[PDB]
RNA sequence: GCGAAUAUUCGCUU
RNA sequence: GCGAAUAUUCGCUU
């Protein structure tokens, strides 16, 4: 079951305010795992003002859409483009795709 | 976009019937295509009845759940297990994910 | 269209 | 953990 699933299946809200502050407190502080790389993240926060048509600044320097970075580099699609972005912050976070992160027995 | 996420992106409704025969409405007639084969169907019906974890009885005569089928054939992980099957008529009906499936303009 | 296998090289925090 | 490339064989309505 990946977070994007979740985000609909585990508490369902007609008031958008109320379905947005309860995903947040529904995920806030769960371990995700990335189906594509073998990496764990904590879920500091949801940014409810990005999504996967959204862009960062690569390694490199470079900029490019999450849209592109899963695809050129994973060969992931992702296919709804309506969904926020999952905040980890490390020690510049890694924003994570809800539809590709799978739930996790989480602290 | 796929046929689940556009279950939940087109219309937003709590009353649960209301949600079920709205999607039916706005779903039956409409033409998918399948990510993992390309063939496209109309979509006849929604069984809601049915859903990933549910078997079929494949051509050869041995019995598989939907899961196993997509895994096995296709290397389709079906994540959300709540979802409805789509129903496809011909002319035994090829039953449908919608996680699976992408939208189309249609007839 | 997705995928399987064997071999040989490769890419990967976001 | 997902994936890329070349070659050689393969599987596919549900």
Same mark, same amino acid.
């Given at each position: 079951?990946? &977070?994007?699933?979740?985000?609909?299946?585990?508490?369902?809200?007609?008031?958008?305010?109320?379905?947005?502050?309860? &995903?947040?407190?529904?995920?806030?502080?769960?371990?995700?795992?990335?189906?594509?790389?073998?990496?764990?993240?904590? &879920?500091?926060?949801?940014?409810?003002?990005?999504?996967?048509?959204?862009?960062?600044?690569?390694?490199?320097?470079? %900029?490019?859409?999450?849209?592109?970075?899963?695809?050129?580099?994973?060969?992931? %699609?992702?296919?709804?483009?309506?969904?926020?972005?999952?905040?980890?912050?490390?020690?510049?976070?890694?924003?994570?795709?809800?539809?590709?992160?799978?739930?996790?027995?989480?602290?």
């Amino acid at each position: 079951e990946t &977070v994007l699933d979740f985000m609909f299946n585990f508490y369902h809200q007609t008031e958008e305010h109320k379905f947005q502050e309860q &995903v947040s407190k529904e995920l806030i502080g769960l371990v995700v795992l990335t189906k594509y790389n073998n990496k764990t993240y904590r &879920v500091d926060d949801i940014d409810w003002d990005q999504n996967p048509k959204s862009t960062f600044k690569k390694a490199d320097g470079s %900029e490019v859409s999450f849209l592109e970075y899963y695809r050129k580099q994973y060969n992931q %699609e992702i296919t709804d483009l309506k969904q926020p972005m999952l905040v980890s912050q490390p020690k510049g976070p890694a924003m994570l795709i809800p539809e590709l992160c799978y739930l996790t027995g989480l602290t």
